[PDB]
């Protein structure tokens, strides 16, 4: 900084001064509150990233010449620096016939995922006859392993493997992120890797457990001490950048070891195809994500979400040092929390990333994006912005106070937290499965029994404080006064609206990101009462009853109220006759 050069044409010299620029980052919320399923812009202004006045530049992770990238973090991800500065070596050779890279497969079986890692090395014609060794460094906030080498691109040169030693990290270090997935009420593990900088065709990644040294590595034949050394995560994938769901076998393998966790050392092994050359700098990213709750999930200490998010912002113009990005988050509800789809659905690395919120995030816990910066005074000083992510209290209403037979009844739910996507209309549907406690209710067939109630239930409709359900299953054999069962008793009256599931009732969001859901159906003349709700399937009465003179109610369960706690709300109305 401060030094210059001098260029001269036409006997008029001009200085070329070198200087640094102060950066500014600021999240810009479109309206007063950042709610679920809304994209808001993130803007960075740093002239130090505008390295070309005639081109528009992107902050790509994979490019070593982009020195800084914005990052957002929640909970405790397991990044590649979790045990301090790693150690990396590249190698040429071939997989052994007993190697997990040649025998394993991703089929959720110990036979496929769990093995040991053996290889034969031929680096005798390599420079100085040693495996390529690297100088390692780690970004403060973006967590990117940058390895410096001597650039080789010759037709002779080629590498096949990469072995990383993750510093001091052991299974104790890993187990504080990765969950059991068998002894947790709701738990999912995810692995995020980016090795685009290597220009490989196929990649395979395995986690290594051992009581010895990750480096130097030893095959099973020399060291006959451990039953297994490798756990397979990805096998011969064609994507250099992916965000994958780990199988149960991986979580079963991590907790399966009989040895105490402190003695076992952990590390990464990789297999490549088509890496013909190495540049002076290459980047590697590898993380573990975890999502879920434990026990009831009612207490805050019992809910967890571990993830890191990187923003690859884009230059607005050619010579505008302004870089533009967006964030969006999905607030978890009782339905999507049970599905691994919602957690694997987010995009962790992008110009427009998304991240999961397990509860209300305000004050010190508000999501914040950090940007490490080189200032005009020459010292490295980060800049950051945060924005709160509140939860909303839901209301449910019924359009009229009194209904008559065959009147349209319209149900609306005003919960902003139920909007999970800003581009698409959000829809919730009724469950038809006689083997689950969430039958003829709006929710999910997947369910669990917890303190607050049933986890797969979001909305249902009742006559006289009893679930309005169709007489189907195994417990519908009661005939009542006569010898006709309640199901055929309804059919003789021409009624097809036997319950809420049979009207085709669905909750449909009015707009793409309105946060208001509407459904409708028509009141029937007759209905079949549920005798006992404590059995699955329900036990139905033997005689149909008129709906006239009975109250109608709708019940909504908010998984997240204004404080992030479970509460149930409702509305009522009266069915009349003339």
């Amino acid at each position: 900084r401060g030094t210059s050069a001098s260029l001269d044409y036409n006997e008029t010299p001009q200085t070329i001064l070198v200087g640094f620029s102060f950066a500014s980052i600021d999240i810009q919320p479109v309206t007063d509150e950042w709610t679920s399923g809304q994209e808001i812009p993130v803007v960075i202004v740093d002239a130090d990233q505008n390295k070309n006045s005639r081109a528009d530049e992107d902050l790509d992770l994979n490019n070593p010449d982009v020195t800084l990238i914005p990052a957002l973090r929640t909970g405790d991800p397991f990044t590649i620096d979790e045990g301090g500065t790693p150690s990396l070596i590249f190698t040429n050779g071939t997989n052994g016939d007993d190697s997990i890279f040649d025998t394993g497969a991703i089929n959720n079986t110990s036979a496929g995922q769990v093995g040991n890692f053996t290889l034969n090395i031929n680096v005798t014609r390599f420079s100085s006859a040693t495996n390529i060794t690297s100088t390692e460094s780690i970004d403060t906030f973006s967590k990117r392993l940058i390895s410096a080498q001597t650039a080789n691109s010759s037709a002779n040169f080629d590498v096949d493997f990469a072995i990383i030693d993750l510093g001091s990290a052991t299974l104790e270090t890993l187990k504080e992120t990765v969950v059991d997935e068998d002894n947790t009420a709701v738990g999912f593990n995810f692995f995020n890797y980016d090795v685009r900088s290597l220009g490989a065709d196929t990649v395979s990644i395995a986690l290594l457990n051992t009581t010895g040294n990750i480096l130097p590595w030893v095959n099973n034949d020399t060291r006959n001490v451990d039953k297994n050394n490798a756990i397979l995560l990805v096998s011969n994938s064609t994507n250099s950048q992916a965000y994958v769901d780990l199988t149960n076998a991986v979580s079963d393998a991590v907790y399966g070891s009989t040895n105490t966790d402190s003695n076992v050392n952990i590390g990464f092994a990789m297999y490549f195809t088509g890496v013909g050359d190495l540049a002076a700098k290459e980047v590697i990213v590898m993380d573990f994500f975890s999502f879920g709750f434990t026990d009831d999930g009612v207490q805050s200490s019992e809910r967890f979400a571990n993830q890191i998010i990187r923003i690859e912002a884009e230059e607005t113009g050619d010579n505008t040092s302004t870089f533009e990005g967006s964030l969006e988050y999905v607030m978890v509800n009782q339905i999507n929390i049970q599905d691994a789809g919602t957690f694997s659905g987010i995009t962790p690395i992008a110009d427009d990333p998304s991240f999961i919120v397990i509860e209300d995030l305000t004050d010190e816990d508000a999501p914040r994006v950090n940007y490490n910066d080189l200032g005009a005074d020459g010292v490295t000083t980060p800049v950051s912005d945060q924005e709160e992510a509140p939860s909303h209290s839901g209301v449910v209403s019924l359009n009229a106070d009194s209904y008559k037979i065959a009147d349209t009844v319209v149900i609306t739910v005003e919960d902003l937290d139920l909007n999970v996507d800003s581009d698409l209309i959000d829809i919730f549907t009724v469950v038809s499965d006689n083997s689950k406690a969430t039958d003829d209710a709006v929710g999910s067939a997947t369910t669990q029994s917890l303190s607050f109630g049933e986890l797969g239930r979001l909305l249902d409709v009742t006559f006289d404080d009893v679930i309005w359900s169709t007489p189907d299953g195994a417990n519908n054999t009661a005939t009542g006064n006569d010898s006709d069962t309640c199901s055929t008793e309804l059919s003789n009256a021409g009624i097809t609206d036997t319950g809420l599931g049979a009207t085709g009732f669905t909750l449909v969001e009015t707009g793409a990101a309105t946060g208001v859901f509407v459904g409708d159906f028509q009141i029937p003349s007759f209905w079949c009462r549920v005798s006992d709700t404590t059995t699955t399937p329900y036990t139905y009465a033997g005689d149909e009853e008129t709906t006239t003179g009975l109250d109608i109610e709708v019940n909504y369960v908010d998984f997240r109220d204004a404080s992030g706690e479970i509460v149930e709300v409702g509305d009522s109305a009266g069915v009349r006759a003339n």
């Binding site: 980060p382 303190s451 149930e568 709300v569």
Partner: protein
Amino acid sequence: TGSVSLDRTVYPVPFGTIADSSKAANAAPNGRSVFPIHATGITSTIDSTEELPTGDLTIHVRINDPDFDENPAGEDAMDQDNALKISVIRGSDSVVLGYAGASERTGKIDVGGNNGTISNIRSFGEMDEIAPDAGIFELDVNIKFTDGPASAQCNSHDTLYTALDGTTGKADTNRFDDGAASGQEYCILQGDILQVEYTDPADASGDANTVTDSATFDLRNGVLQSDKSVYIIGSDMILTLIEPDFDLDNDSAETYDLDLIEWDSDAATTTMGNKGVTGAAAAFDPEPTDFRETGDSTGIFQIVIEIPESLSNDKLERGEEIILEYTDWGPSGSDYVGDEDEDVNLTIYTS
């Protein structure tokens, strides 16, 4: 010159589950540190489903030192090694729970604030700026019921200890750097003192300084009340419980099991929860499913109950006497949660 401030001036005394004691099974606390549900719901001996889950105090510590705000628009941390000390003192004797300021380390509780090597002691870890431009730093630390000076009062606890070190063990040596005296146990009593001291490495004069805040542990007796005396059958009643014992965390709204309350009448005697007589839980239709705070720091819990028609296939009469009973394990009388009990009552009528 820095300042340090604690979350609250007064704190509830924390408790534990039956899994903490090695004592033989019993239908009563029997001098253990547990908070059982009402007796009418207890099945033979006390088992995991018949007491409130483990009650661990969570406190928040804030240090207001602008000198650690190097970055005026960016995150910072209090990086000064072991600059914060958290200790529990009872008269002369003291116990130091841990340090903050340095990278987090597995360690043990210190007895008497006396131990030669500071590396042996638990470190809570580096604190974090509440906002990029705030200049204020916060720590969250969890205090269990076993953390304090050794005393004779707690010999009744056949305590199994949570191993702070890497090892798995239930001995006092695993959690404390010094073993307890024979016939004594480590515990918190009513009237104990919680202090935090901050060692500001640069004060207004440019030298070291020590600033401190203090708080007390205490137990109070509960007040149980309703919106009105007389209710029509099938109407909704608002039920309110004032137990300051239960505001363990200020930041969150705490949830407590509804089985704590007793319903006894001519119709039936029941706990109004999942442990009541068959079909009693559905007969009340609670909203929400159980007690809940009316804000982050109120110590006031509310529940909405529907007056039943028929509790146990027996229908209620007009003017019937109804008694609501709550057993406050940990009254003003008790020294620890367990020990003595006090019963608080409410009477309500059908019209």
